[PDB]
Design an enzyme around this catalytic site. Sequence first.
Site, PDB file in Angstrom:
ATOM      1  N   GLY B  70       0.746  -1.242   0.000  1.00 32.41           N
ATOM      2  CA  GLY B  70       0.000   0.000   0.000  1.00 32.41           C
ATOM      3  C   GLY B  70       0.781   1.301   0.000  1.00 32.41           C
ATOM      4  O   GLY B  70       0.192   2.367   0.171  1.00 32.41           O
ATOM      5  N   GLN B  71       2.097   1.247  -0.175  1.00 33.90           N
ATOM      6  CA  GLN B  71       2.837   2.502  -0.201  1.00 33.90           C
ATOM      7  C   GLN B  71       2.403   3.261  -1.455  1.00 33.90           C
ATOM      8  O   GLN B  71       1.962   2.653  -2.431  1.00 33.90           O
ATOM      9  CB  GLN B  71       4.347   2.255  -0.210  1.00 33.90           C
ATOM     10  N   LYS B  72       2.517   4.587  -1.408  1.00 32.44           N
ATOM     11  CA  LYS B  72       2.121   5.485  -2.502  1.00 32.44           C
ATOM     12  C   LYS B  72       2.312   4.948  -3.926  1.00 32.44           C
ATOM     13  O   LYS B  72       1.371   4.917  -4.724  1.00 32.44           O
ATOM     14  CB  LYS B  72       2.869   6.815  -2.377  1.00 32.44           C
ATOM     15  N   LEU B  74       2.563   1.936  -5.203  1.00 31.45           N
ATOM     16  CA  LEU B  74       1.816   0.758  -5.640  1.00 31.45           C
ATOM     17  C   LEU B  74       0.283   0.857  -5.772  1.00 31.45           C
ATOM     18  O   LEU B  74      -0.347   0.019  -6.428  1.00 31.45           O
ATOM     19  CB  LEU B  74       2.167  -0.423  -4.729  1.00 31.45           C
TER      20      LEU B  74
END
Lengths: 128, 180
Positions: B70-72, B74
């Site tokens: 869920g990091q920016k 992806l």
Amino acid sequence: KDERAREILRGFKLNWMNLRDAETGKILWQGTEDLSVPGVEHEARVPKKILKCKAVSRELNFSSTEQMEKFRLEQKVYFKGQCLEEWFFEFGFVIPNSTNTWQSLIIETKFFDDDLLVSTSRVRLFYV
Amino acid sequence: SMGLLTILKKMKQKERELRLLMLGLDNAGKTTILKKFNGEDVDTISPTLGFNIKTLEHRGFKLNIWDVGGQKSLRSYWRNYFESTDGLIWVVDSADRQRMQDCQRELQSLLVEERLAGATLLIFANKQDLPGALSCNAIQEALELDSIRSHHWRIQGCSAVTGEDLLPGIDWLLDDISSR
Ligand SMILES: Nc1nc2c(ncn2[C@@H]2O[C@H](COP(=O)(O)OP(=O)(O)OP(=O)(O)O)[C@@H](O)[C@H]2O)c(=O)[nH]1
Ligand SMILES: [Mg+2]
């Protein structure tokens, strides 16, 4: 037209594969190198009581530089005779410069994108 | 050869297969929950740079659980894993009040996504084990979860690190999906 294919093939790397005792969640064996390199089928150490484990979880970790849209996996277990194992899984999309993991619950492994073969892995046996 | 063997094997043969998509902001604890499902975190855990897929077996269902980072960077790829999703699992860091707004924003972008039209929605208010982590009602208010109309949903407090309350959430989810 196949320059792309060449890019796909070249950007894929199967880092490590392992075997856990499902009932435990413990790694019996995990390897990080020579998984798809030319030669003698890398093998390793997995304490024979695996047959005394009624459940096993195989896990693979692969990285891919190129984006793929129809990535899949074919895993066949191989000791000569009539065949003991057939495993298939369709991942579909794969993010560029990504590192992914796949694991199944209860040896040549082939990776594909639609029908282009991306890699083949062969490992083997230690009931050590 | 004993009757029990064929009956059990046949029972397994006819288990419905399901695709569960587990999303949420980075550090929310998605991958830890996935590992705790198989009792496993043996501390090899860093941010996920793609997806983690586990094929389990639970409650008569064969589950294909996709955990996507869920990091920016992806999140614009999340839509590539929407198709055929039976259940959407939204993981939230109950103790990260500093992000509740983004968390709520991502969630709402997902619920108007037509490819997720019929998915059942489970919300894991994770990290409940923390000193001062928020309550379900709070998170439920902060996520504007009462402003949802097209999806069956349930918020469930839990702790991925101890595995507390993870099964009640999964069980409810597999039940609602059963109703079709
Ligand atoms: N105290 C506590 N820590 C938790 C809990 N769940 C996850 N953590 C910790 O939070 C950190 C991030 O957890 P992950 O499971 O890697 O988060 P994630 O959602 O997979 O993150 P991405 O890979 O960025 O998408 C880790 O250091 C975990 O050990 C929980 O219930 N309680
Ligand atoms: Mg993760």
